[PDB]
Amino acid sequence: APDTIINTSKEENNSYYCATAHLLRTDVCSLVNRVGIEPLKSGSILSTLEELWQAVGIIYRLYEWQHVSDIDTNFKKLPNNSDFGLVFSVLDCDIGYVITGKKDSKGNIELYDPKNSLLIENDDIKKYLYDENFHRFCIMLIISK
Amino acid sequence: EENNSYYCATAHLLRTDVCSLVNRVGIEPLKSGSILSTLEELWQAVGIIYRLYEWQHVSDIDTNFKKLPNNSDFGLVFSVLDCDIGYVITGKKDSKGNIELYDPKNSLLIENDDIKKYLYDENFHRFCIMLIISKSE
Ligand SMILES: [Cl-]
Ligand SMILES: [Cl-]
């Protein structure tokens, strides 16, 4: 349940905190006052994203590392009205990077990068994944809260 | 009752028993109709921190085993031809790198070589590994 917030600063405003707070529809202050300030567990953003979801009670299904060429095939197999996390490997990043996404009733995809306030809809999604130097990806589909 | 694989599998991995697990936790029902969902929700409750794997066919299981690091405890949720829901067993990759599987509800222990025979006998179709990172007994 949301607390009063100013988006806070330093490094609670990381992808994985920011992506998790958007999907739970809460804020990063509610996220640090419960659970705490999570360091990078085991060096993998995936591991720290997963264990942040375990801490806050998100029940998810995981889809393993694949090349970004076959991402629309994963998009097509997702159920309609579904929210999910998206961990990407990046050419100029030594760790992963997390964005959020949703599938609407009509089967469209919308992607949201909360840390950079970036919102992408179908028909701009291909250009975005290319512009962002995304290579591999891993989808975390929420089942329940 | 509470003699269910997911409770029994979680209590075997935690090095405890289900009755002292259930005064913790309570008796949580089948969340979302999913044995996977119920295992995840039971593990978050008790503090088992896991890495979730993609559902995969049982044929590709020896490769998943092959990539697991030594000294690993894990759960394994199976799809079963004659079961409407999943079934949970426990697993280990010890220091020497052998795989051992334990079905707690039916007290069965399976080691390498018998694993292909075992998974075929049990009518398992796909599977999903939950690798333990952290316990709090
Ligand atoms: Cl709202
Ligand atoms: Cl990883």
From Swiss-Prot, chain B:
Record-annotated membrane-spanning stretches: none
Protein's cellular compartments: Secreted
Lineage top rank: taxon: Bacteria
Cellular compartments per GO CC: extracellular region
Keyword terms, alphabetized: Plasmid, Secreted, Signal, Virulence
Entry keyword annotation includes Signal: yes
Biological role: May function as a virulence determinant.
UniProt protein name: Protein YopQ
Range within the parent protein: 30 to 166 of 182
